[PDB]
């Protein structure tokens, strides 16, 4: 159904604000293998409409907080984008952990887990936080659509359904299984990537001199247009002055997210 | 990159390699691209006094 | 910016230092596009 049949659970998290225990806000899965900082989480607590709430399991009874009281952080704080099912979509920067936490009347609940969240910048200007403006390249980011795309994960009855988790055991009465969809699949799109400053190009006899003044680490990719290409890949952060030889057979280069420019010498 | 004669003159020679760019739909904004400053870069890559 | 909806602009040269002035056709290309312009093209911006 959609969904009105599932139930959350308690499970082992390493850290729970006093050592280890069973946690309502465990993290079974983290995926951070998209481009612009999106991360997907899969926890031991649900997210629904009765508006965007968090129904967690606690000592048999079932509870409910909103999703403005929840707070997850890796090395800087995150900003949740949406929640659906056991899953959660956020905009997190790079770190070596995901912590998640909240607070009912007096107690604070937490769960931290070692996962290598990673910011995977698009393009050839390796940035850390995206730019105010720039050219538009092709990106894949964990989308916001929660429709059924083809991905499924398993679950079972032990009155209500429960995920087929490593942190819960299996029943012996009857293995009544079923599958439910993962939203927020990694889908295509168009993302905004920074444009480096204009390279300065001084001429010389069968030579070019590039003066480069970057704001961030950037790829310079040069080649000759002949039978022997001599491809030079470099990452450049410091202001640099690189001199290249340029024949009649031709020479092209690429500076960050700029297009390729072709220069040709003559006598 | 900025060359002003006195500290209270009226003219400054600015050769910053400023280049404007086309904006993206969604909201009003003036984009540009220019060089990192040279005052900073010299300040951090200067020899001892 | 100097915006005109279903317009066409011309740059007015002031002589500031490193004064770059241009003009962009095709922004902001609808209503719900940012400038509350009616048009799909010939919305014209002047940056300075």
């Amino acid at each position, epitope marked *: 159904n959609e969904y009105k049949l599932t139930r959350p659970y308690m499970a082992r998290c390493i850290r729970c604000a006093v050592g280890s225990c069973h946690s309502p806000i465990a993290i079974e899965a983290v995926k951070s293998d998209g481009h612009d900082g999106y991360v997907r989480l899969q926890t031991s607590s649900q997210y629904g*409409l009765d508006g*965007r709430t968090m129904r967690y399991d606690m000592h048999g009874t079932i509870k409910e907080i909103p999703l403005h009281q929840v707070s997850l952080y890796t090395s800087r704080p995150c900003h949740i984008v*949406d929640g*659906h099912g056991y899953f959660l979509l956020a905009r997190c920067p790079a770190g070596d952990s995901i912590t998640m936490e909240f607070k009912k009347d007096s107690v604070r609940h937490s769960c931290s887990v070692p996962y290598e969240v990673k910011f995977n910048p698009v393009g050839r200007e390796l940035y850390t936080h995206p730019p105010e403006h720039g050219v538009e390249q092709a990106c894949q980011v964990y989308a*916001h*659509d*929660a*429709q059924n795309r083809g991905a499924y994960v398993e679950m079972h009855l032990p009155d209500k359904w429960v995920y087929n988790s490593d942190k819960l055991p299996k029943a012996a009465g009857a293995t009544l299984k079923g599958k439910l969809h993962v939203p927020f699949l990694l889908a295509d799109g168009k993302c905004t990537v920074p444009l480096a400053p204009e390279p300065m190009i001084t001429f010389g006899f069968r030579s070019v001199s590039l003066k480069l003044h970057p704001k961030n680490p950037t790829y310079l990719i040069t080649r000759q247009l002949a039978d022997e290409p001599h491809y030079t890949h470099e990452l450049i952060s410091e202001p640099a002055v690189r001199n290249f030889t340029v024949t009649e057979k031709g020479w092209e280069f690429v500076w960050g997210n700029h297009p390729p420019k072709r220069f040709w010498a003559q006598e | 990159d900025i060359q002003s004669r006195t500290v209270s003159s009226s003219d400054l020679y600015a050769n910053t390699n400023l280049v404007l760019q086309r904006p993206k*739909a*969604g909201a009003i904004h003036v984009p540009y691209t220019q060089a990192p400053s040279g005052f900073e870069q010299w300040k951090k890559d200067k020899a001892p006094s | 910016p100097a915006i005109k909806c*279903c317009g066409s602009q011309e740059c007015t040269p002031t002589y500031r230092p490193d004064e770059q002035c241009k003009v962009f056709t095709g922004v902001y290309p*609808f*209503m*719900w*596009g*940012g400038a509350y312009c*009616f*048009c*799909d093209t*010939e919305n014209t911006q002047v940056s300075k």
Partner: antibody, heavy 126, light 110 residues
Framework: QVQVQESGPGLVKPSETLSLTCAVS??????????WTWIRQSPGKGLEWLGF????????FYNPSLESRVTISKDTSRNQFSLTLSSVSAADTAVYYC?????????????????WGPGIRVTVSS | VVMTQTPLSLPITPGEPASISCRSS???????????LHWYLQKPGQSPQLLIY???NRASGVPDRFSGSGSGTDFTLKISKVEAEDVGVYYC?????????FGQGTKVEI
């Protein structure tokens, strides 16, 4: 292709905040170039534009006759689309429709909107 | 804005032409050269569909039994040959300025 349905209540008690929804089945809401509208048909008055919203960069455009009391919203998690209206009158009885736009690559998408919801009767009454 | 649709109805003669007129307060022509007019068809028991947008531009999955043209504010739909299935109501429709008001209705039957 992209079926749309509609839902919500009927006899909302007068002088109140009325509300309905609209779900686009097998289709995208975050897409650009499709804006999604709201329409009524009162007895004899004829059809009417109320408002809409863009899919991506969803900022709305209402009718100043009822801008004080109308509200359109959006929920991408369920691909839904909705309408809220304060201070219902008596003659607002109508068969509400919700509609998608044609692929707005031109200035013609203003008004030439496409596939509908089958309608929801709404009789403000007791 | 508001606009007058004329006649209120016109039921006659399957197998013949026909036409309807629409008069608008301010002109529905814009500086960019485009007559912002739409014509909605409504069969009984279904939601509105279209025949002619832009004053003279047919739709995609439309029959060729139609045509339309106009000037500024005096606009004209013209049905080339009435069929049996064409019973319903026709609407003149406006786009160039909010509020996007629609026509009052012209009922067609046999």
């Amino acid at each position: 292709q992209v079926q749309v349905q509609e839902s919500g209540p009927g006899l909302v008690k007068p002088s109140e905040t009325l509300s309905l929804t609209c779900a686009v089945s097998s289709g995208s809401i975050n897409d650009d170039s499709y804006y999604w509208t709201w329409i009524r048909q009162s007895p004899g008055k004829g059809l009417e534009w109320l408002g809409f919203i863009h899919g991506g960069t969803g900022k709305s455009f209402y009718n100043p006759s009822l801008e004080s009391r109308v509200t359109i919203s959006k929920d991408t998690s369920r691909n839904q689309f909705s309408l809220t209206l304060s201070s219902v009158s008596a003659a607002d009885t109508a068969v509400y429709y919700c509609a998608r736009s044609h692929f707005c690559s031109n200035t013609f998408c203003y008004g030439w909107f496409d596939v509908w919801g089958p309608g929801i009767r709404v009789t403000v009454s007791s | 804005v508001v606009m007058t649709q004329t006649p209120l109805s016109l039921p006659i003669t399957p197998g013949e032409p026909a036409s309807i007129s629409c008069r608008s307060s301010q002109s529905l022509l814009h500086s960019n050269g485009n007559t912002y007019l739409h014509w909605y068809l409504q069969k009984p028991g279904q939601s509105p569909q279209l025949l002619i947008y832009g004053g003279s531009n047919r739709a995609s999955g439309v029959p060729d039994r139609f045509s339309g043209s106009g000037s500024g504010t005096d606009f004209t739909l013209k049905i080339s040959k009435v069929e049996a299935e064409d019973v319903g109501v026709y609407y003149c429709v406006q786009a160039i300025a909010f509020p996007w008001t629609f026509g009052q209705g012209t009922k067609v039957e046999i």
